[model samples]
Target chain A: AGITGTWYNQLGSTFIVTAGADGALTGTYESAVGNAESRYVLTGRYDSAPATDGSGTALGWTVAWKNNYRNAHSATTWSGQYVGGAEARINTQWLLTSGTTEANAWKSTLVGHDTFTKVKPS
Target chain B: AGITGTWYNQLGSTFIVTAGADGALTGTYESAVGNAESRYVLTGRYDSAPATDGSGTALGWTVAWKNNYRNAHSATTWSGQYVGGAEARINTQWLLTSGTTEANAWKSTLVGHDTFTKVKPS
Candidate 1:
């Protein structure tokens, strides 16, 4: 009935979020990158308060890579929905943009999509 | 330095936005649907205070179609960046979802991209 929980993405990235009473979100993300243990800050919100069962909620959030040298200057923003069911899943599309122009700046803004499901603590 | 202005997309849809001092956004969107004159309320925000030149800003917003019969129960959310230059433009990707499941719900959540440029008043 809520979105506060631990979720895992297809790429082995794990995200933990705490949904505030006012639709604000705060969390941390550990990507399957260089050091999987390194954490990045996450901040975002639900477009509006979720339904009693957390269905049909549209959300967006961002995570900036500040320490991982491989993506140290990049940040990614994700926007998606909580597609509900017996097992709730989040379907999202993301844009990763880099702050440096080392590569083709125009092409540095990459796009991708991922799906996440709540992983209950064992 | 700001994002206030009229923007026109490839599909001829027109979006006008006013960036609030605190990063809040209020705008109106007139789509290229049945009645081009029909307007929808737009609300969203910039990720943060934009640069003084309105560059490197990431923003997200949504518009709900309430009266347009063709898409009466649908709403769209756009996420993108204000790619700055001599002429500022917004490159965005959007997702539109419907409240009613008239068609294949899985396929209904459509995705698309558009680029908009500021349209100066004559």
Candidate 2:
């Protein structure tokens, strides 16, 4: 019904997340060396009624996060359409701005999706 | 006064070219295996007076070529501003079309130019 699990970073490391009651998700990600940590929060709802798709429907979410240094960054939007009940493909475009002017940015399409399986609460 | 020499392909194969009396250039490019051959024709005039710079002149050329298979492709325009008497930088943007609609395209900024030298007649 909801999603939760570990998500891997570009360095091949995993982080944990838990879906909230309001359908919002929150998580903490750390570097493989455990030197850098960040907090991520995302919220979204199904694009269409879940009953129409066995995969639980496509959802669009926005994510914001801050690193250990407290430098804030946010991906204003992310879209994902699930296929199998366990995984969803996500496409996200992020804007990098220095308060006044835009800097370099990146867009990524990821294949893995978080699941509802729970981990021991910390 | 004229230009002539062998040119290489992406596969490190060489081909021959000779400047015509009218200042137009013609060449034959062959794969190292000798199985693939193409005829290239290009023509252009100086963008400005060559004497202004010891680097000769900037000439814009249009190229059309056909391989042994008789498949034709043309880079209708290519602009190269020569920097030195023996070397030039070429910037080219090509359009790929299938008679009516465009198919594919490619662009390249090359850093070498032909020199005015003599070679054996074909």
Candidate 3:
């Protein structure tokens, strides 16, 4: 999984992503969230800043993202490694910014991870 | 968006989902999640259980899911509501399950939210 295309996970879900200028990963994080499971159309941005980990499904190319729907927001990051061809086990990390107290601040923490199975080339 | 077809976000991406038996929202959560912006194919299951929020992007239906890529995994939940014909604001939350200490045990916390624009009629 280079910098673009759609990937599927073990949960039978998919993640369609793309890279923009200044090493930004712009796209939609579709699927379900919240305690009351519902379909969400999350509009978000994954800004890798100066070091966008090279912008791809590989390590070093760091990428941080925030999905906002209505008012609430969900932030996450991906630090993954490309197992050649098109396989990435993205180290799923949560990216927090608007946290007031410690109860909310846990950015850069290893919450979990996601795998990216490239479906299309680049 | 009754539970099939593709949905889009503010970003230039799409989500291909389908509802299975037992009110299981089966599909792919395509996009990025790690620190390094990589395309992910998160195949997960949104088990709404007995409620299923009556299915669709409506409120009261709590859905929980987990995406396991390789050995790492990322879990999240969505408590959403369908505004009208084809609009939903899914309350995005983090569903933590394997957090050892309180440092990691923050499951069922408000992480953010997402919006789902239904393109197809179910």
Candidate 4:
């Protein structure tokens, strides 16, 4: 598995990645918006694949999150890179891309600016 | 004209309608986000038309607003009714629709809620 592990953000958001060795990337994003929490799971492949609508990175993964409170869906994307010649962990950034299910395919609604060093279980 | 003249909202947003007796609606929605001001005019018909994809009432008018600062376009719609059975003046609500220039065609990035009473010249 190239990029498989759990990631966390500064603003209390977490990403549980499950990208396997075959590169079949899948995961979920969790955040505590208020008193309750919202979890978004992997829905589709790389968003910026030209045939569809958006950009996260060439190999990054994007997912759709549903907010039960607001009754809306938001699209989120994640990208990471290895640190210090290590594969067990990476530095990552998670962003919201056109984060509304009420709209079409595109990139951007809220591009979050939180990066955290993700660690994998050895 | 059913909706004409200038209307002002509580949040410093303005709507200038130029609807004619022929119902050829036209106008500009002016507002300020912080110090930067924006003015958007009637660019299209109701987005909820059967041929299109949206919902904002059948007899409403929709427009495209341009923000020079962000260099983006946001859609705005207007709906109004008479307070005491009169013409050229009424209570109106202005809402934002799938407001993003970086994305594809859709019906919501935001649905704004700003109302104003339009005053016409005698």
Candidate 5:
């Protein structure tokens, strides 16, 4: 199966993706973070070819957060490989950044890792 | 000076970035690889806020190669941070995938790293 489907991260966030023939990716992201109430737009690119090891393929996605509060505005990007050797999983590292304010300037950007598994295959 | 400028990677490839007020990134990439003659489109995102260390910001970008030969077709994404402490540099890891063929299936995808330094600032 392809990456066009529903996936759930370890934190319970959900990602619903649609992979186009040209490798364009479009979808929605339902986070487990502060913006859990809203569905953010998801955009990225996919490589259809299997990885060199045949374990998976490479993919990347992003989300732009827009909130009424300027401080809440942010952008996040996740890049990783989707493996289906036995079970489906997306292993990625992400970088996120929010509005910079002197008060919170030191914590305006963050990095983390997450593993996502298939919830539904579309 | 921000990332909106010309940069040269360790391999001598050139990247010219245009950072949008909204954090959108658009640019051109002239590779030091096999496709050295062509200027490919570059797209990505930037975090206006500096990193927690106040050294730089996080950014990500991608390039799609649409060569006449399917085996030469590929897509690549680079995710990393742009540091501006002493000297400006983009430290990144990249993943690339090309059309799969049985003979070269085992090497259809590749991963590597590169460091880019400022060449010109726009």
Candidate 6:
């Protein structure tokens, strides 16, 4: 596999993904525009086809990221399932989980959703 | 040595308390808000409960101001705390400790009980 183009949020946080020889997608995300700069490692697997979309299928992946502050950082993990369709596109659903550092403070152990659009391929 | 109010989940978002000159109540909380916008910083023993809840508690107090943003913004700080229930409000619990930043990535720490309403104040 090859390296894909980078992607960012509406506010410009950047992330890059590269395909490993072993077929895993590995990447890093950097928040360069804020006082709390964060770095994260992401790994995911791509599924060419499942059984739902006629002849095409979906890609199922998971991501984990860490914050850089000592007192208030958290480890956030998420899993996404995406189905490929038109124009090298995929529809995604995400579930997020978190580990925090507060005494009795509640952590995020809920399922959430989001959509991702692919930008490029190598 | 008084048992007061214990509060929790109502699907609404709001917080308040009663307190100390040489006192503190420190407490804990859980959340279900994603895409959250939390602006907090509370500190200042009461002045007859302030002009807001005037008369019996007429306590006045000062509060710190802080906000959370996306993948953006600067180093920010804020703080808060409360007093006696003319209403015997002593607003103070018995314990409280802190020092931390709430990054774009977040974490929570536990404090004490509700109202002296320790749940047993649990």
Of the candidates shown, which would achieve the greatest TM-score relative to the real structure? Answer: 5
- Cα lDDT tens digits, model 5, A36-118, are 54666566766644446454465677665542222234567676667664576876666665544335545645667678888
Question: How far out, in Å, is residue A121 in model 3?
Answer: 57
Query: TM-score per candidate, in order?
Result: 0.56, 0.31, 0.32, 0.35, 0.61, 0.35
Candidate 4: the clashing residue pairs are A98-A108, A98-A109, B96-B112, B98-B107, B98-B108, B98-B109
C-alpha DockQ for predicted model 4 = 0.04
Which numbered prediction scores highest in DockQ against the true structure? 5
Q: Residues A34-99, candidate 4: write the lDDT tens digits.
A: 334467666324322222332223346676656544435556565654432333334455555544
Q: Model 3, A1-122: lDDT tens per residue? A: 25565655544445566666555455555443222232233333444343445544333233323323243344444454444333444444433334246543432233445565655223
Summarize candidate 3's per-residue lDDT along B36-121 as a digit string, tens digits.
Answer: 23333433344433344444443322223333433234444445544334344333333333424554443324354455565422
lDDT of model number 2: 0.40
**Winner on TM-score (2 vs 3):** 3
Residues B33-88 of candidate 1 have per-residue lDDT tens digits of 33554876666555443334323566666665543232344456666667666677
> If candidate 6 were superposed on the true structure by all CA atoms, what would the RMSD be?
15.1
Q: What total of clashing residue pairs does each candidate reach?
A: 0, 1, 59, 6, 0, 38
Native contact fraction, candidates in order: 0.00, 0.00, 0.00, 0.00, 0.07, 0.00
lDDT of 1 by residue, A1-122 (tens): 36777787867888888866644557777785335547766666554433343236666666655432333444566766666556777777676654322234466467788788876322
Q: How high is the lDDT of residue A72 in model 2?
A: 52
* Model 4, span B26-47: residue lDDT tens: 7766654234355655632322
Better by DockQ, candidate 5 or 4:
5
For model 6, the superposed segments whose C-alpha errors exceed 4 Å read: A1-3, A8-13, A31-37, A48-57, A60-62, A67-72, A83-86, A100-107, A119-122, B1-122
* lDDT-better candidate, 1 vs 5: 5
lDDT of 2 by residue, A23-82 (tens): 555555442424454444445554433565354446555555454456554333435543
lDDT by residue (B4-74, candidate 5, tens digit) is 88888766688788977765677767775335547665666665443354544656776655322332345
- What DockQ, between 0 and 1, does each candidate earn? 0.10, 0.02, 0.03, 0.04, 0.17, 0.03
